[PDB]
Write a protein that holds these residues in place. Structure first.
Motif, PDB file in Angstrom:
ATOM      1  N   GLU C  33       0.807  -1.215   0.000  1.00 51.19           N
ATOM      2  CA  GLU C  33       0.000   0.000   0.000  1.00 51.19           C
ATOM      3  C   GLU C  33       0.846   1.274   0.000  1.00 51.19           C
ATOM      4  O   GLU C  33       0.554   2.215  -0.738  1.00 51.19           O
ATOM      5  CB  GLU C  33      -0.935   0.012   1.214  1.00 51.19           C
ATOM      6  N   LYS C  75      -3.737  -0.866 -11.647  1.00 49.52           N
ATOM      7  CA  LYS C  75      -5.090  -0.857 -11.099  1.00 49.52           C
ATOM      8  C   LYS C  75      -5.096  -0.453  -9.632  1.00 49.52           C
ATOM      9  O   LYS C  75      -6.069   0.140  -9.157  1.00 49.52           O
ATOM     10  CB  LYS C  75      -5.732  -2.233 -11.272  1.00 49.52           C
ATOM     11  N   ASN C 135      -7.565   5.578 -14.888  1.00 50.54           N
ATOM     12  CA  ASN C 135      -7.991   4.973 -13.637  1.00 50.54           C
ATOM     13  C   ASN C 135      -8.572   6.030 -12.702  1.00 50.54           C
ATOM     14  O   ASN C 135      -8.319   7.230 -12.843  1.00 50.54           O
ATOM     15  CB  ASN C 135      -6.822   4.267 -12.949  1.00 50.54           C
ATOM     16  N   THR C 136      -9.364   5.561 -11.740  1.00 52.80           N
ATOM     17  CA  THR C 136      -9.946   6.392 -10.701  1.00 52.80           C
ATOM     18  C   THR C 136      -9.646   5.768  -9.345  1.00 52.80           C
ATOM     19  O   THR C 136      -9.092   4.671  -9.249  1.00 52.80           O
ATOM     20  CB  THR C 136     -11.461   6.549 -10.890  1.00 52.80           C
ATOM     21  N   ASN C 137     -10.000   6.498  -8.287  1.00 58.10           N
ATOM     22  CA  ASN C 137      -9.824   6.042  -6.910  1.00 58.10           C
ATOM     23  C   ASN C 137      -8.352   5.954  -6.514  1.00 58.10           C
ATOM     24  O   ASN C 137      -7.987   5.166  -5.637  1.00 58.10           O
ATOM     25  CB  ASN C 137     -10.513   4.690  -6.680  1.00 58.10           C
TER      26      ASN C 137
END
Lengths: 455, 138, 137
Positions: C33, C75, C135-137
């Motif tokens: 992360e 992603k 991409n989003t988020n």
């Protein structure tokens, strides 16, 4: 070392309470003023003492004020000690009964840190949450609430019921003030029922704010709602009577309500900090400007009026600034930028008139500039930090208000506490939390639930 | 046709995104108009409607067969006068055909003051976001 | 150490895909992360594993979502791991085939760092560039 000696002696009395009613732990809680000043030795002493006394007796005690040392920490600003008091994990199986911070679920960096809510669940005549939130003379309330159990309690309750109640009250008040607007603008059977609803809702809020005042600037809104409802009922009374003042109080209350709408704007996160900024601005920055502006206004106003005191020559239009109120009005109109600037007539000294006027303009402008500079200086730091903290504090206070409005049975159904068993036939209420730590790899030897899973 | 034309001249900003400096400038435009202003406009508008119905109600006294004798007569006209005043063109005077002139003037002044402090606070929030978010995020 | 043991064991299945369709490297890509939280041990494991398996098979696979672990890195928000995957230079002449970051020209402090655009050139049905940017988020 001396503590080890004393607690090794049999003649010692550990549970001895003082003339003030406090015991050992209460004193330490009184003395933990700050982490930096003491370098955090007291927490070590608290820990050693509890490890030397394997009973709940001490923390179960109450002073002559009727408060546990924990509750005393709440009434005080003790924070670092409080993080220990709540977050307490003991691997020792003999003294494990004391530790409030349990860990029953661990497969790896993920784990369930289970905490205890005994005096904190807003149940038995007071609670750490209620005590802290309703406390005053403590500016550390933010850091107190940043802790894991209390923060998660507040969030769990907001996601349980409170958001619904907040939006609900917002809807009621919205429809209320809208009906009030329709009334005020148009002044059959629907209007009568609406008026009855208005009277009822006004009585409700009025009595709520009255009880609040009786139980009594973060509370500035209550008095405003009260004044509003008062003006409403007054308008109703004067409406029936053959009076002309019914419109005035009505309208004033209506506008005051549309202003009170900001309090409901305090719900949203961004709008929350925005409204906090409104309150902080109008409290600190503006009042200086308005007071000093007003005294300037009075001075230059009497000056201009005196100069204008020359005979109007039987014509009011010939004499501007004639009435003191009219002169002040002209000045404020000028500060807006609509004022009439002209070489005055019916004046003994037109030059001095002009000069004084210009000086008023310049002084007003620089004064505005100085409220601005003070504003920026305070905001650069106080804006971000103070907004979030004070906002969350207000949110918590309102949440607890809603929670106290409700009865016990509904409350009993909405309890966020989930009971859990603990060793030695120890049953206690708890709030499960799940956290992660990727840095320190420490094998979990102490865990209650064998089967590692939510079941 | 006209509305689409003006909308297009507004869309010209999208082409200003090409230049480096004008790029960060347009990003600032979008971020401002999204975050900062909407709060100001919503809360300003609700204040406006409240004080507007207030002024209109006070003005509801009979025009005496003269529309010019009654300013703030239509709610839309009153709101127009208020926004005109916020611009600084408003006609401020002792109202006629009014039962409570003092209250009228006071409500008006309070509207002005509230609007001003509100503007000051959106400016505060703007700067607080601008200290860091302006340069990098742009 | 345990990874060394397992990859030294013959019964091991390296290419085994899970019920989700993901492989080993996919998992690690889900896992990293941020750099601060893990102190960057995962890149070391990625490196050790590729050095212990001299094939392109792993990076060539697609999950049940039909994505390379690289595509999975897109992603997700995996960043440092991606810097490693793209900037990969190997002096070992046996495994030099794997390294995407090549250095063919150097007279001194100046050099040519030559990089690889196979799945990044916006050619075969998606690309790290297109995936990320859209991409989003």
């Amino acid at each position: 070392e001396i503590v080890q000696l004393l607690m090794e002696h049999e003649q010692t009395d550990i549970t001895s309470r003082d003339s003030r009613g406090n015991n050992i732990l209460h004193a330490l809680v009184t003395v933990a003023e700050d982490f930096k000043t003491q370098n955090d030795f007291v927490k070590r002493m608290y820990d050693m003492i509890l490890l030397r006394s394997g009973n709940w007796e001490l923390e179960t005690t109450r002073n002559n004020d009727g408060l546990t040392p924990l509750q005393l920490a709440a009434k005080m600003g003790k924070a670092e000690i409080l993080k220990y008091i709540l977050s307490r994990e003991i691997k020792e199986k003999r003294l494990r009964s004391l530790s409030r911070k349990f860990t029953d679920w661990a497969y790896g960096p993920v784990s369930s840190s289970l905490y205890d809510l005994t005096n904190v669940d807003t149940t038995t005549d007071n609670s750490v949450l209620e005590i802290t939130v309703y406390n005053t003379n403590i500016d550390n309330r933010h850091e107190m609430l940043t802790l894991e159990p209390l923060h998660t309690l507040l969030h769990m309750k907001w996601k349980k019921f409170a958001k619904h109640m907040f939006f609900l009250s917002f809807c009621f008040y919205f429809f209320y003030n809208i009906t009030l607007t329709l009334v005020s603008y148009y002044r059959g059977w629907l209007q009568l029922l609406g008026r009855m609803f208005v009277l009822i809702w006004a009585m409700c809020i009025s009595v709520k704010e009255g009880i609040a005042i009786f139980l009594l600037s973060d509370a500035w809104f209550h008095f405003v709602f009260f004044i509003q409802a008062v003006l409403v009922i007054l308008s109703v009374f004067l409406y029936l009577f053959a009076y002309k003042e019914y419109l005035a109080c009505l309208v004033l209350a209506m506008a005051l309500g549309w202003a009170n709408m900001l309090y409901y704007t305090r719900g949203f996160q961004s709008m929350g900090m925005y409204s906090v900024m409104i309150q902080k601005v109008i409290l600190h920055d503006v009042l200086k400007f308005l007071f000093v502006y007003i005294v300037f206004l009075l001075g230059f106003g009497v000056a201009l009026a005196s100069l204008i005191e020359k005979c109007p020559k039987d014509n009011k239009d010939c004499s501007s600034y004639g009435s003191f109120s009219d002169a002040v009005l002209e000045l404020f109109k000028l500060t807006i930028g609509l004022g009439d600037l002209n070489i005055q007539q019916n004046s003994k000294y037109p030059i001095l008139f002009l000069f004084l006027l210009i000086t008023y303009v310049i002084l007003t402008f620089v004064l505005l500039l100085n409220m601005l500079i003070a504003l920026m200086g305070e905001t650069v730091e106080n804006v971000s930090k103070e907004s979030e903290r004070i906002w969350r504090l207000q949110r918590a206070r309102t949440i607890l208000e809603f929670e106290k409005m409700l009865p016990e049975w509904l409350r009993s159904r909405f309890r966020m506490g989930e009971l859990c068993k603990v060793a030695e036939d120890d049953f206690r209420l708890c709030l499960r939390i799940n956290e992660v730590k990727w840095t320190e790899w420490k094998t979990h030897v102490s865990f209650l639930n064998e089967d590692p899973g939510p079941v």
